[PDB]
Amino acid sequence: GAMNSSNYAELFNNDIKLFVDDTNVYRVTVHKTFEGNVATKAINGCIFTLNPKTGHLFLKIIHTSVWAGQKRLSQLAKWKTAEEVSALVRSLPKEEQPKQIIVTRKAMLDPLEVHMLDFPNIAIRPTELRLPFSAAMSIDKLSDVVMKATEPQMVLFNIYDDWLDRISSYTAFSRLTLLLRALKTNEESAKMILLSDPTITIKSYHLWPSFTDEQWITIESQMRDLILTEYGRKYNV
Amino acid sequence: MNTVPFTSAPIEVTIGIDQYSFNVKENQPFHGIKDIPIGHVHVIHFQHADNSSMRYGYWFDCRMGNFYIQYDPKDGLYKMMEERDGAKFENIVHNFKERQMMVSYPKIDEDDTWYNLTEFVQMDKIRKIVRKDENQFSYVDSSMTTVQENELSDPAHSLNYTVINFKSREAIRPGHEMEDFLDKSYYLNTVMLQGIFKNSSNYFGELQFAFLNAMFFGNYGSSLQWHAMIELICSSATVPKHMLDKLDEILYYQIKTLPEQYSDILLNERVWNICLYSSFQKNSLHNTEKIMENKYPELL
Ligand SMILES: CCC[C@H]1C(=N)N(C)C(=O)N(C)C1=O
Ligand SMILES: CCC[C@H]1C(=N)N(C)C(=O)N(C)C1=O
Ligand SMILES: CCC[C@H]1C(=N)N(C)C(=O)N(C)C1=O
Numbered sequence A: 001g002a003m004n005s006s007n008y009a010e011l012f013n014n015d016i017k018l019f020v021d022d023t024n025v026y027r028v029t030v031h032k033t034f035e036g037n038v039a040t041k042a043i044n045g046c047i048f049t050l051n052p053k054t055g056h057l058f059l060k061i062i063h064t065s066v067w068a069g070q071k072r073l074s075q076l077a078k079w080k081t082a083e084e085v086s087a088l089v090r091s092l093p094k095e096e097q098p099k100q101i102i103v104t105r106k107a108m109l110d111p112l113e114v115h116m117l118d119f120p121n122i123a124i125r126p127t128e129l130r131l132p133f134s135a136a137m138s139i140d141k142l143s144d145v146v147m148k149a150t151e152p153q154m155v156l157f158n159i160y161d162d163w164l165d166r167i168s169s170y171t172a173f174s175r176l177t178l179l180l181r182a183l184k185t186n187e188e189s190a191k192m193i194l195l196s197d198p199t200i201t202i203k204s205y206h207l208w209p210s211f212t213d214e215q216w217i218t219i220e221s222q223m224r225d226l227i228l229t230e231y232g233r234k235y236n237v
Numbered sequence B: 001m002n003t004v005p006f007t008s009a010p011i012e013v014t015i016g017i018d019q020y021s022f023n024v025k026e027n028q029p030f031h032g033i034k035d036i037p038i039g040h041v042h043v044i045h046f047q048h049a050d051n052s053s054m055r056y057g058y059w060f061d062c063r064m065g066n067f068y069i070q071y072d073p074k075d076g077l078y079k080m081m082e083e084r085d086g087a088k089f090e091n092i093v094h095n096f097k098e099r100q101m102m103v104s105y106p107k108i109d110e111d112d113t114w115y116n117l118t119e120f121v122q123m124d125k126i127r128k129i130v131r132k133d134e135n136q137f138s139y140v141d142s143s144m145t146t147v148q149e150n151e152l153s154d155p156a157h158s159l160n161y162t163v164i165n166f167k168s169r170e171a172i173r174p175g176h177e178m179e180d181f182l183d184k185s186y187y188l189n190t191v192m193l194q195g196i197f198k199n200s201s202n203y204f205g206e207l208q209f210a211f212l213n214a215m216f217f218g219n220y221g222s223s224l225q226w227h228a229m230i231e232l233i234c235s236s237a238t239v240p241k242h243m244l245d246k247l248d249e250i251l252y253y254q255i256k257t258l259p260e261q262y263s264d265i266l267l268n269e270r271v272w273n274i275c276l277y278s279s280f281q282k283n284s285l286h287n288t289e290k291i292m293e294n295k296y297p298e299l300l
Helices: A006-014 A073-091 A104-117 A131-140 A139-146 A169-183 A187-195 A213-235 B086-098 B115-116 B123-129 B145-152 B177-182 B185-197 B201-218 B220-234 B241-257 B262-266 B269-278 B285-297
Strands: A017-021 A027-032 A038-043 A045-050 A056-062 A099-102 A123-125 A153-158 B003-006 B015-018 B020-024 B032-035 B040-050 B056-060 B066-072 B076-083 B138-141
Touching: A006 A169, A017 A073, A017 A131, A045 A073, A045 A139, A056 A073, A073 A104, A073 A139, A073 B177, A099 A104, A099 A187, A104 A123, A104 B177, A104 B185, A131 A169, A131 A187, A131 B241, A139 A153, A153 A213, A169 A187, A169 A213, A187 A213, A213 B020, B003 B086, B003 B241, B032 B086, B040 B076, B040 B201, B056 B076, B056 B123, B056 B201, B056 B269, B076 B086, B123 B201, B138 B201, B145 B220, B177 B185, B185 B201, B185 B220, B201 B220, B201 B241, B201 B262, B220 B241, B220 B269, B241 B262, B241 B285, B269 B285
Parallel strands: A017 A099, A099 A123, B003 B066
Antiparallel strands: A017 A045, A027 A038, A045 A056, A056 A153, B003 B032, B015 B020, B015 B040, B040 B056, B056 B138, B066 B076
């Protein structure tokens, strides 16, 4: 059934699973036309498909050409997402295919279920967690690859960098969601926190800076400060 | 006009014949139903006074044989039986008519309700849904489950309605996932009509039989089948005009006849709101929409 705080450790057991987030698939800018009407212009998007135990991110880039001549794009985007996830599963060896796929929005359930009818043994599940994966386009290297794409493309990342050498996947996922929640709250403050120290760099093969363990504790504390300070200004608490 | 004689009525029971019904008291001198119109299927059904659950009954067509009902005190129900001795049957029906021990099927001459509810229903198709081939009549009750309910437990006592499942490989063509899920015309016209039912008459016959099983016995699985067959049409962008017009008439008379007291357990709010106000056919069921909005505006 649904995924929530009661069954949170299930994410880090040894059953292969993937989160699918579709919130950055269909992206637009809204603008005025010369006649003073309003129109949209699509920009490149991405499907965020993440193995929370290993950190493996299957970033399918959605090039704006996929929308050409199509109607009802917000509806199509859900079915295009489900088509690409289904294609990903079919491309994997049987022993690498997921046993469950968790969608971050309930509107993805029927499109993915229908695309996965050939896989009756893969559970398609919703979640009650409010996960901040929409903020993935605030990670500069991910945004860069999406905006530079001239054609459909899949790019593979590890969103945990090398963290699992030193911490568990529960801790790594907790760090990731804290970082993304912060970026979603105040992107500028969050990024200022992450980079303020010029001697801590992001390796070419990494997404985040090379913090020591002691430095991550400080960073995580500062991200918690930034989120609960804003929760209080926002709700006068 | 045909007759269903009764040996006796040893236990108090409400007896239904099609859309009519009457109370018989314990050991009352009741010996059956006469003047039953020829040309239609019929259903004779029963609820004991002492049974909260278990309305049961028999679908039959008097052109296919001579049938009588007699109480079985071991199995505790009114049983339908077939009489092969036509002389014995003729003899009994006449003695009963002479002593005036039978109720008359009470059809008003203006009244096409039963025809309109059974237009496409044929005994041969009933007997394929209800499998018991040594009898020419078919027993149904409130508890019987459908083949699809058994997939989600006795196969001999099941209702073998056509399985309809909108999230199934039968309903969805590879590479047309969104198209076929949002517009079920392929599933309706190719898979079901051309493939399984062969024509819309057979489809409507199963739809009408499911509704009647659902209304007369409170058979849950039949209710599910009725709504699924409606939803499959309403969710199809491409339906023959004659099918939509006939569907509107079929549903009008079902809603018209529907017992107001049981409307809340017989009508699925989601299906009816989708069909009348969202679906491709939201503007094609004028008669049905008008009677629904005037009789059950709560549901909507
Ligand atoms: C001879 C005893 C059975 C019996 C009966 N009691 N009734 C009512 C009937 O109509 N038939 C045809 C019958 O066979
Ligand atoms: C779905 C409703 C079935 C049903 C019933 N349960 N009862 C008790 C009844 O008197 N009638 C007339 C019925 O049709
Ligand atoms: C005509 C069906 C009435 C009915 C029923 N008899 N049962 C068992 C059920 O679970 N529901 C939800 C119903 O609506």
